Amino acid sequence: EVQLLESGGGLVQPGGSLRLSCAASGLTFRSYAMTWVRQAPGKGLEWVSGISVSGGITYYADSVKGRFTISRDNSKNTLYLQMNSLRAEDTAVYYCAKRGAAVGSFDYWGQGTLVTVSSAKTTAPSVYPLAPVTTGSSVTLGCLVKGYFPEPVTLTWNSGSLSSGVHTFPAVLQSDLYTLSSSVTVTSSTWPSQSITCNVAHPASSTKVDKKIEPRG
Amino acid sequence: DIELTQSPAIMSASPGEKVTMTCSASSSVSYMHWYQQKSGTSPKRWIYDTSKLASGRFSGSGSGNSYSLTISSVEAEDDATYYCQQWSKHPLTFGSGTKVEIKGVQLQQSGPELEKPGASVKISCKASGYSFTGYTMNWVKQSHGKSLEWIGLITPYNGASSYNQKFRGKATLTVDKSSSTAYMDLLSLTSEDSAVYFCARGGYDGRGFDYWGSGTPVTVS
């Protein structure tokens, strides 16, 4: 019942301004207080800010005191985070939270919005097909996705037919771009008899590319 | 210690004949109790306090050493192993057993148990139909080829337990008063001890074991 949708999260060039929204559904807003928590992508947790029930009484974390600016309202029903002079550290997923008591826990949270910061411009991905150059009846094939930004690319095989045998790893950032990779392990008789394609899209670049895995010699 | 010699080994008394079987003692004895077992099942109280019959062709008599049981008119329903138990010195010992071939309160134990030589097991014995913390609980050993040997007993209330020193260390008698179910714990088993084991209640003013239990044989290999 008790929702909180973060929205406004995009990419921004370094030093750029940007604002966040958390529109609440389920609670009497006037009569509770709020916070802003950011997850260092992958590994960590950290707190940003807190506002009181009045909202003259603000709190902040030292890596953003004067850069980031909280703000709240009753009538439009919206918690506001103004994050200014951004840098790549700030690049995180921000979670909007409802303080269960006045300086108490964070009991309820939002599904979460990502903010990205980088000198890196939008680049479409290069998709490459991986073919082996092995007896034990289980062949291994792969789709590697190199030189793309930002996240994500939504990679599958054969438009969601081949599911058990897939191994898509986490993409890892280098030279201002991500380098995602994938495997898939089918029977040594099923290939190359049946045609195998990998489907790698980037809503960022509006790119929908199809790469068929040819067995060359 | 006192050990009892019964005779004959294998009696052969006819229907319509008077016979006398004897149980001669090593030292001078106070009182005596006679019992009766049908192969497989539990024994039963036949005679007690020298001559005093339990609840009408049988009888008992003697003085000092010489003590004998007598049957008036032998029938075809009186064909069982007859034993003699002494009641004087610690501990309690039975006779070897008088076999008679014709010339022609429920105490439920656990199931028969099988184990490996060099390990332990607990066997149980539940009672109901009387006040459990006034009488005792007695354990006896019926071996293949030998006779009855009394292991020990225990007065549940007080946890107080006495043993035939033959068994001190092989035997551990334990009790829980709430369920009124007494346990024996046999530790480290051998090819000798592969035998039958009977839990019995002692009667009023130590007048013998008037009720015996089902029977939990043990097997060791």
Add this chain to the structure above:
Amino acid sequence: IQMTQSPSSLSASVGDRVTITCRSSQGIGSWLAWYQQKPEKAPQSLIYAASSLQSGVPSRFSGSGSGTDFTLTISNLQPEDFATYYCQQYNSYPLTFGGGTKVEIKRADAAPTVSIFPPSSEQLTSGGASVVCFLNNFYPKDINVKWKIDGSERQNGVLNSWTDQDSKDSTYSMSSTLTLTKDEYERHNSYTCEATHKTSTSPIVKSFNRNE
């Protein structure tokens, strides 16, 4: 103001008592919290103050301590209780969080599915070159890949990625990448992955030669 969780990551069996610990520097009465995180999804809340269960939490959980040295327990794990658990404090501003404890399942030991892939003909020609390595479906999570070219070792320009524990077959998988230009790809000939695991003393080797 410090906040330390123990261990790094823990692994136990379904139906075993799980013991997680949370220390601090300065005393914090009972202004401490407990939060469950599902992989790349919302964090859930548990114990809100030392020994106080949040509304809708199974009682199998148990929050204890006071002052500085605290404890979170789970009597008899269940299957949906595997998660990154987080210890937090709110006594003073700022709020502080812990290093989070990744609590995983336990299966018996297993060895990987090593495969290799020299560069696509599109790549080889375009200006790059990547030698890939898939060491799939093994346990535990710790391991030792090592590349060799023309006999001599290489440690430089090596990316790596492990997936999280799998919920069906309970194995971690691994992508290692040996990135070059068309050039030193040509220069040195031979190419290798020496995946060394706990299972074996001496390693599982996947090799090729560029030309052949």
Add this chain to the structure above:
Amino acid sequence: CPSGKKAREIDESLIFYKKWELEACVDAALLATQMDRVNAIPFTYEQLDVLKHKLDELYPQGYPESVIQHLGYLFLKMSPEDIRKWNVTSLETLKALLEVNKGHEMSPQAPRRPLPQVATLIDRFVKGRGQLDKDTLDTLTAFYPGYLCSLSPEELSSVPPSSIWAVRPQDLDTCDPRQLDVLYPKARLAFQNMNGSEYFVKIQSFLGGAPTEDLKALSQQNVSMDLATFMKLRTDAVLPLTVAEVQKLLGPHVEGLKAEERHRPVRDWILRQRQDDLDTLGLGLQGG
């Protein structure tokens, strides 16, 4: 008594005797001296009946300091008519009679007759010792802890401060405001040569029967109180109290207030304060 059956001393072998042999063969100037042994020796109740009759002949009025130590399984037999004319003055003899009295696993809940002849022994001892010693209460609450809140307001007040230590809050479960007012100060007078965190730990059990004047004075020690220890508090000690005071007590343990809103010392104190004042607690509370 037969020749060879005359009891040379106390042994295993006496169990294979009868009721009439015991009275003729056993000595009374023996059974007194060596008694500790008979507790291990399993006799039948019928044999113990004769042993009980053998000592009646030696000690007729009562039973000395000597006899009651190894009484064991006879305390049950002994009826109030003779127990009246007894003497103790030893913490040891006590435990023995109470251990065996804990041989009642018939009705774990009060069977409509919890304590018969033990009731007497207790009142018999407290008069003998004089008061209720520190030591004394420790061993009592070990067999009956709930006995403390099962006295009359009188016997509660005849109880010195240095006999509150032996109390943990497990005893004070079935206590009403009347009985707690009696005990309260006695603690505050016992734990007066103390301060700080060391002070509070112990005091928590009684705070249900305390006044406003000492809720003020507690706040200025930065102390922490739980929610379960707030439902105890007397109605009329709560209502003089401000917002910040409550928040400087329950503090971390406050979050789950919402749930216990319609209960004893809350439902009223909410309404008493201002709407604005409650909203700064940010816990969603109404009336003003």
